[PDB]
Structure 1
Amino acid sequence: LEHFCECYFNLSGLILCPVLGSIILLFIPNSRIRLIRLIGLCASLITFLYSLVLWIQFDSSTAKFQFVESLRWLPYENINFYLGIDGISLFFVILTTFLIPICILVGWSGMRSYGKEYIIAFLICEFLMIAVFCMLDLLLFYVFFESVLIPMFIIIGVWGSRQRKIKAAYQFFLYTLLGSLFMLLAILLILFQTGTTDLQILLTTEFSERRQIFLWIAFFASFAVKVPMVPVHIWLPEAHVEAPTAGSVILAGILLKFGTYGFLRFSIPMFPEATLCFTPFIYTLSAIAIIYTSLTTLRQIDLKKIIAYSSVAHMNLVTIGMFSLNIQGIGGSILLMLSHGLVSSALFLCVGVLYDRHKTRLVRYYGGLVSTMPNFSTIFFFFTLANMSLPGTSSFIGEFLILVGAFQRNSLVATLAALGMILGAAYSLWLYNRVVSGNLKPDFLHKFSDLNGREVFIFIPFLVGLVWMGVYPKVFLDCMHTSVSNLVQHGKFH
């Protein structure tokens, strides 16, 4: 059945944009550095504007999928694949399209040595990740998620700073592939019942409570590695620290969101009974992760290691929210996913600004930077506040909505999750004051430069987005409520 959509701007062209950029860049000599830089930047910016348009034509009243279009693999038409979005996936497409040009801009100064391979890898990542977020089929979700492993592996291994990138890349690839294989096993078990992998159909089939338990575990084994949940979180610090700055931005801001997106998109609505049965288990794992990882964060001595550990606590709060299974919980989980994608990316950008000049991640070398880099200090303080969920910032909305959702289900889990307010403040303020406050240490660092124009411009949209979601989250929540409501209700008829 051809499900071709009426809209002019659709999903397939947004898929095709970075692909065309990559093919063009394949054939341009490395001597033409300016041309390569401009072509990559412009392709990414056009993709971002295309996604913004897709946001305008979005219809915030339906529980259905939108812009649905189809994609036909065999003339037999037994296997035909669909793309479409809703109010849970729209902003993730937008976030991906927004972050990719930021990645191209962060490496602007070093592009003469980076080459076209850097831009091509990031464009391919963009294409694959947008595809992943736009897929109405378990099997293609699988295929497009595993595909990102190759360019991410290359990005970490080639442009990482030091030789620990070897181990970091190995661990990233192997952990993620193990999880992916588990979810492939789940996909095949589903296919044996249903004869299909189309998401819309699986949302309308009934699974046995028993078959649901096994399928839920097999989904959990991928998703908990992706989130990450303890104790399969240890790949994340190594990988997110050893990666280049833009690589860390993509890893934390987008790739981490894929596990929570998988929970929201397949596990909760397809197996509601198993979702109910496992809820105490998820609550326990997430609460343990928040407390233990926050306390580990407190004792880290590397800038990137502190920012990377912080992401584990934030994502497990997201899981608590989404498994609360109400409007506050799921809405807050999605809002915190987007806000984290902005805030952690900005924090990695701040650390990258420091590392590009001074080539150290050890906190002890820095100090007193407020007197030589006041602009960087102010921006760093703002994003530090955002990482503490300060009211007025975007992260507070999601954090408090998730606590609201959890409290209505289980007051103990909400109480353990609200401890994050105390621990995250502690490590965020300690980091900021050890880096920026105090006196300079001229025996380690004596030469300084505040942000140039490119760095200031890079930070501006992050600031605008954080404040915008913090003060008026209605623009986002209005487009999401129908989808969130239908997700919450799926499986029940009262």
Structure 2
Amino acid sequence: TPSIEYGLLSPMLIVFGVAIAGVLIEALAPRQSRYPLQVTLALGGLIATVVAVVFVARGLSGTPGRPAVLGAVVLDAPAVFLQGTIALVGILGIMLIAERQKATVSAGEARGLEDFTPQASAVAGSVAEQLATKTGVMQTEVFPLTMFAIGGMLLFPAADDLLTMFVALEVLSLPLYLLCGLARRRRLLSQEAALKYFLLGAFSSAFFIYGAAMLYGSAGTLDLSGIAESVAAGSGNTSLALLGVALLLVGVLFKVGAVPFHSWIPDVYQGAPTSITAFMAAATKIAAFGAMLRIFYVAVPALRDDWRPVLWAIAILTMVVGTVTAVTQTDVKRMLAYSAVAHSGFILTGVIAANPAGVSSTLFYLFAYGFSTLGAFAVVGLIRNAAGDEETSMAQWAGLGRRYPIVGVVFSLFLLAFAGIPLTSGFVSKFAVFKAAGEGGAIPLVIIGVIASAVAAYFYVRVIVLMFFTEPPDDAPELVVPSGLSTAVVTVTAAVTFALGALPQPLLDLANSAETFLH
């Protein structure tokens, strides 16, 4: 019989079982009790996942990783590190998702402070939507779907086979496609975002599977270890291998947001629910870059001389176009999305390093940046126009910091982390990736990313200018708490973003210990 390492799969199994249990709650639980259970089932579940991870991590203190399901899944140090990062980010994202309306005379608060329309199938602004809002109904199906996303995402770094990694890509993509279209406010934009994300993601996934086919043809094996053995031994075709690497790179780059594939990120981040947008921008990037790391440092290191240049052309672009485009942006959400494109480029610079320092720097970069992005988007979700819609217009943020100094300082901290100012986790993060690139002979990327960061500092700083140095307008937006969960998310995220800047050696030792994959 096939040996199954349940202990190693423990975090993944916990997450997927919790998702299935949440679907059961949706099925056979009364409406009034669905939300208390789901969130309780969800957050606790993720907490268990985190616990599982550390246990697995401790188990990995011996063998340098080990396959779990007869290949097709490998939990080595990078895999467990990324899984723990994704688990923490998912906990925070679900706490953001579970936020309900602050308070009202009627008890019909409907998970709206998290931007989720009470009835997604209901037409925007229709009498049915208004009645659903009044009755306080909520589609708790969000919590299962989100868990599934996390599930697939937890798998995506750990997938040691092309088939499993493709399945994980689809499993994480579909729930996100659905979630993009559930926004409570600006429903038309959210539905457009869902459609765009679905179309481009399906297109990219077709490319990903075609590349997997090409790699399988070249190497005659789907395990990444087998592909590496074949390409190194020269047994493969060596042209199908390169073509498959390119096509698979297309899919992963789309998932992370390289410039040739970035265009979806701005629209999707602007249109998707703010909580979903935050959780996405952090954890999906983490998972996609984990898979990319596995592909390049395990599956196909031998062809470094072949794919190294291509990534250069992308990384440069991702640093340039991602930043230069953000310069003229006037929407906070859109500006942050372009910032995410640029930070994908910065990650790719470390990935290009092709050295263990590259792996460690990328892992730390992903952790710190995922936290910073989650916090920034969570904060953005609180700036509410008079009508209640998120005042994403940057001009409307003028004097926001003066009205709300604490939230303003927190958002400025996140912005400076993105800009990579020292004493912020962002600087340690950028320094790690650029140092890894320099040690890897890619110091021209260090220079170009330095210039790109200088450019991006402008649009990171303009927000602070509006927020603090400008007098508030007459119709300036107002904060909405809206509950303890959102404040906890924001404070935890800011605390991490500051601690990893001041005192990064913690978790940097962890990143260093996870600089080696189970080749």
Is the 8 Å Cα contact of residues 9 and 54 (structure 1) preserved in structure 2?
no
CA contact (8 A) 2:270 2:333 kept: yes
Change (3 A) 1:391 1:254: same
Select which of 475, 493, 515 maps to 1:462. 493
User: Within 5 A, what are the aligned runs for 1:420-439?
Assistant: 420-439=452-471
- Aligned-partner residue type, residue 407 of structure 1: G
Which stretch shows the higher mean deviation, 1-10 or 189-198? 1-10
1:25 aligns with 2:25: yes
8 Å Cα contact 1:16-1:127 kept in structure 2: yes
Aligned pairs for 1:292-311 (under 5 A) are 292-311=321-340
Q: Distance in 1 between matches of 2:13 and 2:479?
A: 45
Q: How far has the Cα of 1:38 moved from its partner?
A: 4.2
Distance 2:149 2:283 in 1: 10
Q: Pick the aligned partner of 1:366 from 391, 397, 422.
A: 397
Say if 1:373 and 1:451, in contact at 8 Å, map to a contact too.
Answer: no
Structure 2: distance between partners of 1:198 and 1:8: 18
> Could you tell me how far apart the structure 2 residues matched to 1:449 and 1:61 are?
45
Aligned runs of 1:146-157 on 2, under 5 Å?
146-157=170-181
Aligned to 2:169: 145
Q: 1:133 and 2:167 equivalent?
A: no
CA contact (8 A) 1:343 1:387 kept: yes
Q: Indicate the residue corresponding to 1:188 in structure 2.
A: 213
Q: Deviations 1:59-90 (Å, cap 9, x if unpaired)?
A: 56667324x432xxxxxxxxx65433222222
- 1:161–1:243 CA contact under 8 A, matched in 2: no
* Residue 90 of structure 1 pairs with residue 89 of structure 2: no
Alpha-carbon contact 2:15-2:148 (below 8 Å) kept: no
Q: Give the counterpart letter for 2:473 in structure 1.
A: K
- CA offset at residue 193 of structure 1? 5.1
Q: 1:473 to 1:87 in 2, by over 3 A?
A: farther
C-alpha change, 1:421 and 1:369, in structure 2 (3 Å) is same
Distance 2:478 2:419 in 1: 31
| CA 449–337 in structure 1, closer or farther in 2 if over 3 Å, else same | closer
After superposition, the C-alpha distances for 1:100-154 in whole angstroms (9 at most, x for unaligned) are 3333332421424433122222222222222333322210110121133322122
* Larger displacement relative to structure 2 (336-345 or 212-221): 212-221
Residue 416 of structure 1: aligned partner:
448
Q: Distance in 1 between the 2:253 and 2:486 partners?
A: 35
Say whether residues 1:348 and 2:373 are aligned partners: no
Determine what percentage of the aligned residue pairs are the same residue. 17
| Preserved CA contact (<8 Å) 1:374 1:450 | no
After TM superposition, the structure 1 = structure 2 runs for residues 21-100 of structure 1, keeping only pairs within 5 Å, are: 21-28=21-28, 31-33=31-33, 35-59=34-58, 64-66=64-66, 68-70=67-69, 82-100=72-90
Are 1:382 and 2:382 counterparts?
no
Distance 1:160 1:81, change over 3 A: farther
Q: More deviation in 464-473 or 338-347?
A: 464-473
Letter paired with 1:43: A
> Which residue is equivalent to 1:214?
243
Aligned residues: 476
Higher mean displacement: 271-280 or 193-202? 193-202
Quickly say closer, same or farther: Cα 1:294–1:8, change in 2 above 3 A.
Answer: closer
TM-score if structure 1 supplies the norm length? 0.87
What is the identity, as a one-letter code, of the residue corresponding to 1:128? G
Q: In the aligned structure 2, how far is the partner of 1:104 from the partner of 1:197?
A: 34
Structure 1 window deviating more from structure 2 (109-118 vs 376-385): it is 109-118
Change (3 A) 1:186 1:454: closer
Q: Does 1:177 align with 2:176?
A: no
Letter in 2 for 1:19: A
Is the contact between residue 317 and residue 417 of structure 1 (CA under 8 Å) also seen in structure 2?
A: yes
Q: CA RMSD in A?
A: 2.7
**Cα-to-partner distance string for 1:381-431 (whole Å, 9 max, x where unaligned):** 221222222222222222112211222303322111111331232111111
Aligned-partner SS, 1:277: helix
> Within 1, Cα distance between the matches of 2:319 and 2:395?
26
- Per the TM alignment, residue 288 of structure 1 is displaced from its structure 2 partner at its CA by 2.4
Q: Distance in 2 between matches of 1:290 and 1:158?
A: 31
The answer to whether the 8 A contact 1:393-1:471 is kept is: yes
Q: 8 Å contact 1:268–1:275 — kept in the other structure? A: no
Decide whether aligned partners of structure 1 residues 317 and 12 sit closer, same or farther in structure 2, where only a CA change above 3 A counts. closer
- State how far apart, in whole Å, the 1-side matches of 2:63 and 2:310 are: 29
Pair 1:170–1:57, CA change in 2 (3 A): closer
1:186-245 per-position Cα deviation (integer Å, ceiling 9, x unaligned): 222333455542334334333454333222212222122222112221111000110001
Q: Could you list the per-position Cα deviations for residues 440-462 of structure 1 after superposition, in whole angstroms to 9, with x for gaps in the alignment?
A: 212x2376666754432121221
CA distance in 2, matches of 1:414, 1:15: 38
Q: Once the 2 structures are TM-superposed, how far is the Cα of residue 434 of structure 1 from its aligned partner?
A: 1.1
Compute the TM-score of the two structures, normalised by the length of structure 2.
Answer: 0.83
Q: Which amino acid aligns with 2:442?
A: N
8 Å CA contact 2:384–2:391 kept in 1: the answer is: yes
1:119 corresponds to which of 137, 140, 143: 143
State whether residues 91 and 338 of structure 1, in contact with CA within 8 Å, keep that contact through their aligned partners in structure 2: no
Q: Deviations over 1:308-334 (max 9, x none)?
A: 100111111111111111233332122
2: CA distance, partners of 1:138 / 1:9: 18
Q: C-alpha distance in 2, partners of 1:10/1:106?
A: 25
**Take 1:44 and 1:17, find their aligned partners in 2: how far apart are those partners?**
13
AA partner of residue 41 (structure 1): T
CA contact (8 A) 1:25 1:36 kept: no
Alpha-carbon spacing, 1:187–1:354, altered in 2? closer, same or farther (3 Å) = same
Structure 1 Cα separation of the partners of residues 177 and 399 of structure 2: 36
1:198 aligns with 2:229: no
- Taking a change above 3 Å as real, the CA distance of residues 261 and 446 of structure 1, as seen in their structure-2 partners, is closer
Contact 1:240 1:308 in 2 (8 A): yes
Task: State the alpha-carbon separation in 2 of the partners of residues 174 and 268 from structure 1.
Answer: 30
| Amino acid aligned to 1:176 | G
